[PDB]
Amino acid sequence: ARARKGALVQCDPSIKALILQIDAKMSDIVLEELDDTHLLVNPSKVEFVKHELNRLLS
């Protein structure tokens, strides 16, 4: 009965955990935790998450 636009992020559980921690501190990123390997994410934030994840490795 309802549709909502979003970005579906599919990733290994290890990376899901990093995303949720990024979101903890920036706050505006995760719309919903779908299952072990999927997150519903704010579409405008995919850039930022992919950028921030890459940086954590440095």
């Binding site: 549709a3 290994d12 990376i15 890459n54």
Partner: protein
């Protein structure tokens, strides 16, 4: 050593993200099952979960499934 970081980066490049639409709040199992099976049939279903009566569809499949929904419900 820490080419552990290298394996982390490799796994990081195995992340996939899609644009589209999450469908939820279904009255009946029947309707949830009808639209997601239609989406599965035209190749635009990316994810679903029977217990939550939710699924996600790619952007490019969005209007096909809306139009199916109008016609069949």
């Amino acid at each position: 050593v820490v080419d552990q970081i290298r394996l982390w980066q490799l796994e990081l490049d195995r992340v996939i993200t899609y644009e589209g639409s999450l469908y939820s709040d279904f009255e009946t199992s029947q309707e949830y099952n009808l639209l997601s099976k239609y989406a599965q049939d035209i190749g635009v279903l990316l994810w679903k979960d029977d217990k939550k009566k939710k699924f996600f569809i790619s952007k490019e499949g969005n209007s096909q499934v809306l139009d199916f929904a109008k016609r069949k419900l």
